[PDB]
Point group: C2
Chain length 262, copies 2
């Protein structure tokens, strides 16, 4: 069982919506077991918030014994830019989770960020910025509590010059802050570990994006797994076990290896 | 059941050893089967031929229904170069397999090359050279019959300037033919499909080697997959059990197996 909580949060005068899915305890009368938590930054190419792939992933991750929160980060809608706002909102969401840690029994040493497509850009960029003191200051992230332990990236947008979006006017709408264009360029040995996956045949998000982030992580010897699946079927929305999608099985095992999951 | 055959073969005045592991036919009421075959180019940094990881891998793969041959390609031993000799030996080994195909029931439309570390350089370079008639001529492969359908690469050496060897004298010893240094640069749409992987327990070069090959394959629209579990034991044991499942699935997706 789970409790669903919808909220509208606000930071930096850019309100945003989240849904929390709080996993129930085995008993209300037992000493609490603090569960890890995954914060999901959806896809949607910075114009919408994808749910199609994200909802099944949330379900699967929870069945493994985790809480999940979906973060509907700033979009370009209504002639806005995404940054720096999305980074502040992700920071504010992590902070909010910490404030809920006793109420819903959240292990705040085991906060995992997961980003898909455009959300992958937000997460990957966060992973860089939030782990460098100078950049936290610059993007005002030192106002927030809590930190992530690791990230998961599925078909992430990583470099806004690498094919998505298709035009420079679109890139500059997302942000004119060129420092945030290329998330791989913000990787340092301080970046938290990452599990990255994509399909080789991806015609929506150019695969060069994940190759770029993985290169940089490996260059700085950050703990990293990367799975580029041969067939597009492995990237389809969810419904080794031959009867279930491969990638969640790999990600879960990786989280176990990283000490982030029982 | 299998039969083991040891041979010392010779091409280009550079002898080389192979061992072939020929899967037995079963007497049954299933239709005749010619089995695929995997040719293993071992690791060993061009100074030895590794068996420690290769042996159980050969064993796992044969259990999926394939023959295997192990090719002890040219090393730098005795003040020698690796190339072009290793490519010619691999070509010769494939030719040899075609001549043995009726005797052992080998599906020569399903020859799979598997290269580990330094042997990954041989296999990756071969996938590029042997699929281009002009480079076939240049490296005297025009002479040999048979062609591989796909390759597997474990933790491969791909670009002899991307970390290993650590010295120019070393690189030159492997080969002074700089066209052969960077296998990714020889990828074309004619290159065969490639499955690449590495587990955390694997000791090899920086994985940017693998990434560079895989990107080249993507750029030329050749089927490829890449499974990096980590770069550097219940969990490590498990990775060893998991990657072959992915390899075998991929081989099935490619029509190369069951
Ligand atoms: Cl959607």
């Amino acid at each position: 069982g789970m409790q669903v909580e919808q909220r509208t949060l606000n930071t930096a005068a850019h309100p945003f919506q989240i849904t929390a899915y709080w996993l129930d305890q085995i008993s209300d009368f037992e000493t609490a077991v603090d569960y890890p938590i995954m914060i999901i930054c959806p896809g949607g190419g910075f114009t919408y918030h994808s749910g199609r792939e994200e909802a099944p992933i949330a379900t699967r991750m929870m069945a493994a014994g985790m809480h999940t929160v979906v973060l509907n980060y700033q979009l370009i809608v209504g002639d806005q830019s995404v940054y720096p706002w999305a980074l502040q909102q992700l920071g504010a969401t992590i902070d909010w989770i910490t404030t809920q840690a006793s109420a819903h029994h959240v292990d705040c040493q085991r906060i995992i960020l997961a980003g898909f497509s455009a959300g992958g850009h937000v997460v990957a960029t966060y992973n860089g910025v939030a782990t460098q003191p100078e950049l936290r200051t610059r993007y005002h992230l030192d106002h927030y509590q809590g930190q992530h332990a690791a990230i998961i990236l599925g078909y992430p947008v990583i470099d806004l010059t690498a094919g998505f979006p298709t035009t420079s006017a679109a890139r500059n709408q997302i942000t004119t802050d060129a420092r945030l264009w290329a998330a791989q360029r913000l990787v340092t040995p301080a970046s938290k570990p990452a599990f990255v996956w994509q399909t080789a045949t991806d015609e929506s998000v150019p695969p060069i994006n994940s190759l770029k982030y993985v290169q940089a992580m490996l260059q700085h010897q950050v703990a990293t797994a990367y799975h580029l699946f041969g067939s597009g079927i492995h990237g389809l929305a969810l419904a080794l076990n031959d009867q279930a999608a491969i990638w969640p099985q790999l990600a879960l095992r990786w989280l176990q290896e990283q000490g982030l999951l029982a």
